[PDB]
């Protein structure tokens, strides 16, 4: 009965860019989700399966932990049925989603004086992302008839852009870390309970 390493996702020093969102697989451990739900240091804690207090009394075959950084505006987009640059080209929740979406403001950590350019997001994509897909390609979007041939140009743009987080930014433009916990139950014995 080992403890689920929830600390190593939540309290991790370095967080990923939404376009290359990290996934950690949780298994063969017990986790108290109720301490997480009552922390109040999370600005966002919406659940789409069952209430956070009730799943403490629920088992699961696997818990996947997806982590990334976005803007305040874009948090609402981390939800099923949501449209937007994040939800369409970066990370899309399915409509059958049965998990929780958690976030907190990381202005203190992730915003820097002249703009932090490490965090990226995908500005152009030909098609909307399927749920739980990850695209990390760096192919040049072709936005016009002129073929791109792999060279940045006119109507040929490198497909990723950067939030330039400044601590002076308004709230909506401030970085938010996000952890998405998806609870899966298969034809296999459960390994994650409370």
């Amino acid at each position, epitope marked *: 009965t080992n403890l689920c390493p929830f600390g190593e996702v939540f309290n991790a020093t370095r967080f990923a860019s939404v376009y290359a969102w990290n996934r950690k697989r949780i298994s063969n451990c017990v986790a108290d989700y109720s301490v997480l739900y009552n922390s109040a240091s999370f600005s966002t804690f919406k659940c789409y399966g069952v209430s956070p207090t009730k799943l403490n009394d629920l088992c699961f075959t696997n818990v996947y932990a997806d982590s990334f950084v976005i803007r305040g505006d874009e948090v609402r987009q981390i939800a099923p049925g949501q449209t937007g640059k994040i939800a369409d080209y970066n990370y899309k929740l399915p409509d059958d989603f049965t998990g929780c979406v958690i976030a907190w403001n990381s202005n203190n950590l992730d915003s*820097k*004086v*002249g*703009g*932090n*350019y*490490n965090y*990226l997001y995908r500005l152009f994509r030909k098609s909307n992302l399927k749920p739980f897909e990850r695209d990390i390609s*760096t192919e*040049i979007y072709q936005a016009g008839s002129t073929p791109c041939n792999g*060279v*940045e*140009g006119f109507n040929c743009y*490198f497909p*990723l*852009q*950067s939030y*330039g987080f400044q601590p002076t930014n308004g709230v909506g433009y401030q970085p938010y870390r996000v952890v998405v916990l998806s609870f899966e139950l298969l034809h296999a014995p459960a390994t994650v309970c409370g």
Partner: antibody, heavy 127, light 111 residues
Framework: QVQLQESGPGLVKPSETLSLTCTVS?????????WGWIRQPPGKGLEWIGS???????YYNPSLKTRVTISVDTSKNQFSLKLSSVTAADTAVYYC????????????????????WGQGTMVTVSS | QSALTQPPSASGSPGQSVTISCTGT?????????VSWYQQHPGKAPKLMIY???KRPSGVPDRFSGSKSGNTASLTVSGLQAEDEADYYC??????????FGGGTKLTVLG
């Protein structure tokens, strides 16, 4: 507003190691961008040496690859240059500069344009 | 000696317009749009005039402008003044080889 400043030994003995450092201020090197070294022999053309971003990744000019190391120390917020086996062809004004683009994954990152430049420190190689 | 070939000198008369060319190969200039022009006055650090072929940094006069066709880049100075008398260097990415420079071109104002 960002400022770059080169410092280092004015003189170097032939076949020994040239060691200059560049101290950034006004912007944490770790926060973004590529950062490069470019040199100009007296009365001769610009030469690009190498660039680096905060992870430690480096790109170098093929003709000086075997002799060049560029390092980053983020805690002191500076980057440095060592060039070994110096000859008189290394007598030059050595500039440090910052790139135009803050994104570190753009095509040809650190090998495009340099926006902010230092004053330049000169190194003469002589006995 | 320089993998980008740039005319050793160039000149124009005050009020007029002068153009400096910069020829490489399909693997540098012809290959990518990362072509950069710098202006260096004697005894002073280089200054960026033009990046990404035609893009002007802030504070750079509109009189300056750059372009490219095929293997050859151009920097055109309009309304030539005395303060423009300097050396100009061009630059471009080279794939395997990285960030190659031109030999430079001295521009005289001819007054």
């Amino acid at each position: 507003q960002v400022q770059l400043q080169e410092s280092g030994p004015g003189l170097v003995k032939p076949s020994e190691t040239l060691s200059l450092t560049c101290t950034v201020s006004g912007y944490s090197i770790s926060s973004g961008y590529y950062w490069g070294w470019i040199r100009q022999p007296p009365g001769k053309g610009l030469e690009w040496i190498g660039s680096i971003y905060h992870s430690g990744s480096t790109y170098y000019n093929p003709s000086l690859k075997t002799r060049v190391t560029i390092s980053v120390d983020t805690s002191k917020n500076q980057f440095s240059l060592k060039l070994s086996s110096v000859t008189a062809a290394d007598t030059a004004v050595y500039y440090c500069a910052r790139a135009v683009v803050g994104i570190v994954v753009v095509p040809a990152a650190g090998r495009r344009a340099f926006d902010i430049w230092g004053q330049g420190t000169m190194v003469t190689v002589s006995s | 000696q320089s993998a980008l070939t740039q005319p050793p000198s160039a000149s124009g008369s005050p009020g007029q317009s002068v153009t400096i060319s910069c020829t490489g190969t399909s693997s540098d200039v012809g290959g990518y749009n990362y072509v950069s022009w710098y202006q260096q006055h004697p005894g002073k650090a280089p200054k960026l005039m033009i990046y990404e072929v035609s893009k002007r940094p802030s504070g750079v006069p509109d009189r300056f402008s750059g372009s490219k066709s095929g293997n050859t880049a151009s920097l055109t100075v309009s309304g030539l003044q005395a303060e423009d008398e300097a050396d100009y260097y061009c630059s471009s990415y080279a794939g395997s080889n990285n960030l190659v420079f031109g030999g430079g071109t001295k521009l005289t104002v001819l007054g």
